[PDB]
Design an enzyme around this catalytic site. Sequence first.
Site, PDB file in Angstrom:
ATOM      1  N   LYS A 288       6.320  40.445 -90.850  1.00  0.00           N
ATOM      2  CA  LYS A 288       5.277  41.146 -91.577  1.00  0.00           C
ATOM      3  C   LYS A 288       5.790  41.580 -92.948  1.00  0.00           C
ATOM      4  O   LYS A 288       6.999  41.578 -93.217  1.00  0.00           O
ATOM      5  CB  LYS A 288       4.805  42.341 -90.771  1.00  0.00           C
TER       6      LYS A 288
ATOM      7  N   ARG B  32       0.992  56.400 -82.061  1.00  0.00           N
ATOM      8  CA  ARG B  32       0.372  55.680 -83.170  1.00  0.00           C
ATOM      9  C   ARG B  32      -0.885  54.924 -82.725  1.00  0.00           C
ATOM     10  O   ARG B  32      -1.995  55.251 -83.156  1.00  0.00           O
ATOM     11  CB  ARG B  32       1.387  54.737 -83.826  1.00  0.00           C
TER      12      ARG B  32
ATOM     13  N   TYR C 143      12.897  55.654-124.210  1.00  0.00           N
ATOM     14  CA  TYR C 143      11.875  56.693-124.303  1.00  0.00           C
ATOM     15  C   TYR C 143      12.481  58.064-124.050  1.00  0.00           C
ATOM     16  O   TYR C 143      13.369  58.222-123.203  1.00  0.00           O
ATOM     17  CB  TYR C 143      10.734  56.452-123.306  1.00  0.00           C
TER      18      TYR C 143
ATOM     19  N   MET D  74       9.041  49.904-118.066  1.00  0.00           N
ATOM     20  CA  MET D  74       8.199  49.132-117.152  1.00  0.00           C
ATOM     21  C   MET D  74       8.820  47.769-116.858  1.00  0.00           C
ATOM     22  O   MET D  74       8.759  47.285-115.715  1.00  0.00           O
ATOM     23  CB  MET D  74       6.778  48.984-117.726  1.00  0.00           C
TER      24      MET D  74
HETATM   25 CL   LIG Z   1       2.202  51.393 -82.059  1.00  0.00          CL
END
Ligand SMILES: [Cl-]
EC number: 5.1.1.1
Lengths: 386, 386
Positions: B39, B139, B272, B320
Amino acid sequence: MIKLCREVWIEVNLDAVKKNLRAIRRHIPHKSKIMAVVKANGYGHGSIEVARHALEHGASELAVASVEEGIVLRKAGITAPILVLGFTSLSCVKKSAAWNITLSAFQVDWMKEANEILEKEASANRLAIHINVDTGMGRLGVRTKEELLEVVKALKASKFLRWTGIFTHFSTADEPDTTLTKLQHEKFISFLSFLKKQGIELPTVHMCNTAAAIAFPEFSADMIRLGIGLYGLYPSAYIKQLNLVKLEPALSLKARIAYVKTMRTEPRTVSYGATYIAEPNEVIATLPIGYADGYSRALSNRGFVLHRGKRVPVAGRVTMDMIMVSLGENGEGKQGDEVVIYGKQKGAEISVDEVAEMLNTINYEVVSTLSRRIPRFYIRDGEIFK
Amino acid sequence: MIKLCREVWIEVNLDAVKKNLRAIRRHIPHKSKIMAVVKANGYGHGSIEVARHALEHGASELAVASVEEGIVLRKAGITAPILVLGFTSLSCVKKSAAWNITLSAFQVDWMKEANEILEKEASANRLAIHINVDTGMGRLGVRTKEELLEVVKALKASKFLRWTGIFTHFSTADEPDTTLTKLQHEKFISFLSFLKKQGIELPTVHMCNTAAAIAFPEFSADMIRLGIGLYGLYPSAYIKQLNLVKLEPALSLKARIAYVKTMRTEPRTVSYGATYIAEPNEVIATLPIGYADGYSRALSNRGFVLHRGKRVPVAGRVTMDMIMVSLGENGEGKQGDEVVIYGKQKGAEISVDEVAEMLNTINYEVVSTLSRRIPRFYIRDGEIFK
Ligand SMILES: [Cl-]
Ligand SMILES: [Cl-]
């Protein structure tokens, strides 16, 4: 309405963008043009749609951070000038010339070699160049009268390069002490009247950013570079309190509750470390956003989201893809309710400046680290599209 | 070598992912299988090429965060089973069945309606389902033995669904104190003997993460879920100390110097805010990386990088798209030298775990927030390819 497998998303309001641009056009001189800055994926807002829209409502050129950010815009159909603000490797000279992207440069030796490369490869197009002068930022650019004159000479001899601009950059124009900003200005206008006393004619001069254009609109010269003010956010709290220009923020972030439950059964531990224990009749709601999306882990046991017009707190540690929030004792909530993470809901608000103060950073970084695995939707004239 | 317009990149070493899987295969019961977790863009390493390699050297199935992340895998040819660890809206029930993706579920109404959707379309594909049991993390999942038998009964009365696993998650398995891991196990196991004393057959059972497969391999049951250990990183300093298994880090981050100068003229300010003022024979160098790439602003005036085998400091504020580093009074270096940000060079090393400590977070966040505008190159058998 909005149909997703994993229910989290961003909305960019383009009616706000067009308003911000009108405000700026009306503040600076009528003679000066506007360069819209859309690097880093439009400060995390999306580069294609914002630039499309900014060119139709007041801007005339665009600025990006790399050749690859510019090619994305030519492929979307855009025909305007694109300037690259960092450093480009000689090994991309032939490709920049082919896509007609304008490059920054500042050395005698880089100039001559980019000219011989395009001389051998037949010719086709000429490569356009802006010269960067360093007046006190210390990052890129040339630093003496004598050095600059040599670059202008090597550039004017080069038959395949073309000179279209010269610029500088102020490092403290968003601060209430203006000493250093006026320093840079005199150094710059002096370097270029030296050029004039040699009989050299100048192209487009640009030097202001969002903060400079608001605070010193008499430095606008030929062109300005409008960035953070395009998306409805101020460079600093100081520049906001001046009260000279009114901007409207364009971005917000939302999700949908995925599960609700009462914690009346043991154990009552929540998330990693078991740093939070609920009470027998507390209601815990789970949500699809985590720190790999850009919602900082620093916010565990510390942040807020908006549910039904009210702030409810984050309970336990943030995980990679999910956070839990507490609806209290006997709750009130259902799978599928809409939750606001940044933005407005009913009466209440959580702003990007507020989260950045909480984490000791600036709004610039809160927006431009929003992952690209989150889908972006655009609002224009009341209607939604993509 | 590499040829880039903006000169910054990542290298991922697949020879090192291979050794990690071997090491773990050796230490667990030879009866149990391995599911690889990719993932979130494969914790920032890239999901496609790491999944392919894993399926070739010991893994049997994959886990992702959402249906969208699984469709990028099937689009590159991967035909293995893929399980979604988060919640999927009924919106995508018909899409999941067409791309043959496995989903988690734990509710009676959701099964009823999921089965209805595919009934009303005939549908020749049966959707595979895994049941999540919440034994201590609160969860997602079901919580009592009573209400897990209703869900088991409903799934069974569903001709268009298919049961292929049952699982839970350890919330504290990487801590010295084992009290809570012992208890969740005790609960999960008694919910299963409860079921078995009913006539019911059980499918694949899994509960172990990287940490719990190292410290408690007698918990391996049918299958484990290997996440952080795959990329060569330890879930905690405590699991690493137990010295039970050897891991090798897989990822480095590098760039090339874009400009160098001696600060001779005034002013000698850098970046900066003018927070750093150089010396008149100090050498200052400029790199193409910044906080929109994922290099935190919090490292302003505080981080290091490796040049020619030495640590140099970041000078001034991070911006940046670029940082600035100091090489000292009369320092040696030229435009084009190579620098290492995360990893090893000559004798030195800056590790992901050191940078994580500087910022008060964990290695998971550091790697999985590196942006997608940075290209990744892969190394297999000591050589290159994107
Ligand atoms: Cl879970
Ligand atoms: Cl600059």
